[PDB]
Amino acid sequence: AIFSDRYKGQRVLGKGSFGEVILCKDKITGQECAVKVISKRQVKQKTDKESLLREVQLLKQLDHPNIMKLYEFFEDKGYFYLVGEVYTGGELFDEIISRKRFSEVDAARIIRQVLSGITYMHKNKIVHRDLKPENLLLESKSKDANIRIIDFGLSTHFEASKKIGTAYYIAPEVLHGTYDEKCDVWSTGVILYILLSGCPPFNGANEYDILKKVEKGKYTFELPQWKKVSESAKDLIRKMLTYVPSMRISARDALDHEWIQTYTKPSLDNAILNIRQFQGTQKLAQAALLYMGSKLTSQDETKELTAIFHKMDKNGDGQLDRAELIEGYKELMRMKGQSMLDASAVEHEVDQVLDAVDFDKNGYIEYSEFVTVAMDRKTLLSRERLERAFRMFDSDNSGKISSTELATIFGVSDVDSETWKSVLSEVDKNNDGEVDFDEFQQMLLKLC
Amino acid sequence: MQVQLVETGGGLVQPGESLRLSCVASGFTLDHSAVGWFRQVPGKEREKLLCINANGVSLDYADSIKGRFTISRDNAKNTVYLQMNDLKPEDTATYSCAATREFCSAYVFLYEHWGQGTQVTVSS
Ligand SMILES: [Ca+2]
Ligand SMILES: [Ca+2]
Ligand SMILES: [Ca+2]
Ligand SMILES: [Ca+2]
User: Fold this and answer.
1) N or C: which end of chain A has fewer CB within 10 A?
2) Is the separation of the CB atoms in A19 and A80 below 8 Å?
3) CATH H-level superfamily of A89-150+163-280
């Protein structure tokens, strides 16, 4: 049972909480697979080895259209290799925001697939615990292809050490300690909630606040977009989001619910908008943040940032790359108050996360992107800088930002061409065709 | 005066020839400016070509112009140069230059003080 003789590694594919996904080619069978590489040094193993191996064997025995099929498992002296089938379609929410129309029917199909997979896995007595939209992938880029869930049953054995974006979906019983499979349902519920509103039912500025909200267990449907949503869906959400597990609806029961039953043979535009805002700011938001960072800093800020950036830009090309980011990281953090005693590997890892704040994805971090990093969001997106920015964008001072004004500030000046119209619409909540300060602020602060 | 960049050196040339373009700053100095050259073909969005910081050079464009175009800098003469070699019928377009503070960006929209540019035409 050895990896190198069985599979061949090529290039990194995706980012996982427990380990990193890499595309691999097979020696003898000549097929492409996806391997999750988990580090014994980086992550802790909760259960003993034999238990993990047993669970993995059971997983290798299993098969369902809505779960990630697990082919092989390899244990290296240093690392763990978890081999399964490949996925090219990417995460679900991205595909959702890619499309123009999103109705309760689509969400019903999605949740049906999810709950089907969940029901199968529960039939074999397996619990995910950590269920997120990221764990929902599409096997192919083809439209209306079905969903496959990944990292099923791995959470029980591993606990990561890196942590905001799992608090939205975690179940109260999981937070309090011991739990059963129904926690997954709760998680699914949360997703469904988002799917219909584009906002988390339990929300907060940071992990602590979000966890406070979910632990309190209280939530509402007061948001305006819920007026566009049928009552049955809200009822199903209520049954899924009950604090006490025994009273909570099971996955199998939920699969036969009235909502999912009926809606599987209007458009929730504000919802999908809020999903786009939720997701990576694939919007006017990135351009606005970059503009604010590069052009709207005070003299002291510009001086300090330019100085530090010069110190980190070793070859002086005007870009920061992986190596320069690594060599300059500890000193940058030393500058930002917050790490002398930092292991080279976690330094490379955090440097990689910052490489995930590389908006244009050219592989380099510019000065503007760098300003987002060096300046905490509290300062860069203060009330003052936001107001000044909005005032700059709003030339005629009407109180709203027009498409033409956006085209004027940072524009090739194609007001038509559906460029600026599409870019505007992604932020235009009330559909007046303009951006008031509320929407600008919500855009840059991910607020609802 | 007011603040703008002016381009010169635009003309008609045979394929495979060489041409030199100039960008002069009026109303401000290039001392703290990173200047980049961009080419726009009619009905197409502006394309990053090259950029020079206050000092160093970056090849922003796709590698189609790599090794053929050089960007130069003379602060005293307030001028940025673009040396174009081995011209192709692919290269004919409007060439203009823009400036951002200190460091060369790779987002077109962070640039300012755009110029009317110069017509560069390669024979067909
Ligand atoms: Ca560099
Ligand atoms: Ca970048
Ligand atoms: Ca206005
Ligand atoms: Ca509006």
Assistant:
1) N
2) yes
3) Transferase(Phosphotransferase) domain 1 (1.10.510.10)
